[PDB]
Design an enzyme around this catalytic site. Structure first.
Site, PDB file in Angstrom:
ATOM      1  N   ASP A  54       0.827  -1.212   0.000  1.00 26.77           N
ATOM      2  CA  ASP A  54       0.000   0.000   0.000  1.00 26.77           C
ATOM      3  C   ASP A  54       0.861   1.261   0.000  1.00 26.77           C
ATOM      4  OD1 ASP A  54      -2.270  -1.720   0.249  1.00 26.77           O
ATOM      5  OD2 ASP A  54      -1.917  -1.754   2.420  1.00 26.77           O
TER       6      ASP A  54
ATOM      7  N   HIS B 201      -3.643  -2.177  -9.938  1.00 23.97           N
ATOM      8  CA  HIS B 201      -4.048  -0.796 -10.147  1.00 23.97           C
ATOM      9  C   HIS B 201      -5.496  -0.718 -10.628  1.00 23.97           C
TER      10      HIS B 201
END
EC number: 6.3.4.4
Lengths: 390, 390
Positions: free
Chosen positions: B14, B42
């Site tokens: 992250d 993504h």
């Protein structure tokens, strides 16, 4: 300030790396094993302990990527110790090395030396490691719980004998106290050596990156040890294999016989298609060519520069799948041989002109330099054109 | 002539790598996935297809180190294709990728997403691979023979349902013809791109070396994507964890919530001890710092520069074993915060002085430069001090 060098063989093994690694330890303060188990070693037969243990200034590391049988290791340590070597002061072992234990060897047998099943345990996040020896409660509870599965597979699936848990605990009783002064965070030590500017040799037998916890941009030179012809031990595809009298003569002059079995190895011409792939996969900086004198006196030499598949397509790299070698043939260049002996030559200019031309052609084809030439077994029987650590 | 760049996250995930990888594809002709499976991706949610599939000039490679579910891949391909993308012309897949199949997922379940058991099969030299789809006789005989073992383990050992062989064959009936135009020797293609002087981006999620068949000395730059603070999802040791109102404010401003679960992530101060190890392991060249604006308005910032274990020893690297974090505390440096917004700043000189000093201190501590700063979600909301491909 220091230089970090990887040394590996470029063919199918038996490239003669032992003498060369020993020579390079003259310039290294640190020697690291980072992969494999106990498969092959320099002449005592050392299979796990890195090569520079004879030089007093060298620290030897068995990094986390090595899987090791502890009793195999202690036996090597004691054998060296009997010959007087202060092994425990200069040998360091990663706490993260997975252990090879009797159930791993058993699994190998039922499938048919424990190295594979050890890596299997590691990938399954269940492997016993060196660090577990120092938590004897955990070691026993994991070992028992690991055996519940492996013995089940061994007996209920392969109908082979089990590995007894109690006897394994008895065998492991001493391992922690024997290894304790040598265990450490090997990656941290290597990076401290790198910070101090010390030369580090990575001895190839998992990459250096994962196997030693050592990033790729810190590698300064990759030396590829390369025999002047090709050999194979196992069965399967060997495009430059010689099944004739030249192959037999190479086998005899090169002493290409199984050290244990005595079976002659398969011999063949130098294969630059194989070498092209090795160079790419390992970003090899330069070659050390060995056993050139084996080819002394041959009338002509051949080098495979391409492959032609069954359809007649020209291949510059060996195919991925083994079945794709079926009906595949090498494309050869021919070079003239020499008659003068190249054994123990110490300066390139003393080699015959045709030997130097053979070496030059290999360099032209592969696109990297031959930086070292081995012409015999002694240490001073080496020509170093460029030192890996220079 | 070209440059070969690895991009990876430096913390616990992250780190905000998606926008940065997309930005870097502007300068790459080639994007390579070399590890992992379908874990995170993504924003369609792309888990297996590499990132540059939107740019028309980019070729995307799934190299041999990726394990892949074929139905997962075809579903991503069809989803992209529905949005019009000419995926099949620009996606290439290694024949050597091991397959993730239903029995792998089942094994994961009985132990408690199939990625582990797939790598386990590979290490045991028994894995089905993409290349096996093109030998339907072999695919079925290996699949049946693999299932004899795995279903035995699944039912006789874990008392869980079996995976039906016939239904797997039915499900795989189309896979070869659907993947055929895209399968290849990915390592060979990458080395041909390198020879042509094209920029190659390796998208980190096994190393680049083994995972893409691409030697370490060809890697020119390793970009480490690094959040300006630390987050964790799972349980276990988190030395800089904030359990207070500053932690809660970081979570809110950073939108640090599980994309599926909605659970808040654990938040904490920047941890340079963690980063030191990441840099060493990956030989990181420079950092891309993300989400700096999350810290806008804090009165003071802290950076962990060491750890102190239970004995009071000072550690410069995180300990190897998880149990060694018990009773371990961070050693903090304190820096003044800033009040002005750093969101969407495009030139370093526009940042507040205390923001620039925070970034300078991280550079001093870690010894490598911050070469990129992300200040918001847009592509032009990035400061590039030095381009990875320049």
């Amino acid at each position: 300030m220091g230089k970090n060098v990887v040394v590996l063989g470029t063919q199918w093994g038996d490239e003669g790396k032992g003498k060369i690694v020993d020579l390079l330890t003259q310039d290294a303060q640190v020697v690291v094993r980072y992969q494999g188990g106990h498969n092959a070693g320099h002449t005592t037969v050392l299979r796990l302990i890195p090569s520079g243990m004879l030089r007093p200034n060298v620290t030897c590391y068995i990094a986390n990527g090595v899987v090791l049988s502890p009793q195999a290791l202690l036996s090597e340590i004691k054998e060296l110790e009997g010959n007087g070597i202060n092994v425990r002061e200069r040998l360091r072992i990663s706490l993260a090395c997975p252990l090879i234990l009797p159930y791993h060897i058993a699994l190998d047998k039922a499938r048919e030396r424990g190295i594979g099943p050890a890596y299997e345990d590691k990938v399954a996040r269940r492997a016993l490691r060196v660090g577990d020896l120092f938590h004897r409660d955990r070691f026993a509870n994991k070992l028992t719980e690991l055996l519940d599965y492996h013995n089940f597979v061994l007996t209920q699936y392969f109908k082979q004998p089990a590995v007894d848990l109690e006897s394994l605990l008895g065998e492991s009783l001493q391992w922690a106290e024997e290894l304790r002064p040598m265990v450490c965070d090997v990656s941290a030590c290597l990076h401290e050596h790198r910070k101090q500017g010390e030369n580090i040799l990575f001895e190839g037998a998992g990459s250096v990156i994962n196997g030693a916890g050592f990033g790729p941009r810190y590698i300064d030179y990759v030396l590829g040890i390369t025999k002047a012809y090709t050999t194979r031990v196992g069965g399967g595809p060997f495009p430059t294999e010689l099944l004739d009298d030249v192959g037999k003569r190479i086998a005899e002059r090169g002493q290409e016989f199984g050290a244990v079995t005595g079976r002659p190895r398969r011999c063949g011409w130098f294969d630059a298609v194989l070498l092209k792939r090795s160079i790419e996969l390992n970003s090899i900086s330069g070659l050390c060519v060995t056993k050139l004198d084996v080819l002394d006196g041959l009338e002509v030499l051949r080098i495979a520069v391409a492959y032609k598949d069954r359809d007649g397509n020209i291949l510059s790299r060996p195919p991925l799948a083994a079945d794709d070698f079926n009906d595949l043939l090498p494309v050869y260049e021919e070079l003239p041989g020499w008659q003068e002996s190249t054994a123990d030559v110490t300066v390139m200019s003393d080699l015959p002109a045709n030997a130097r031309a053979y070496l030059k052609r290999i360099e032209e084809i592969l696109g990297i330099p031959i930086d070292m030439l081995s012409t015999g077994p002694e240490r001073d029987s080496t020509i170093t054109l460029r030192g890996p650590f220079l």
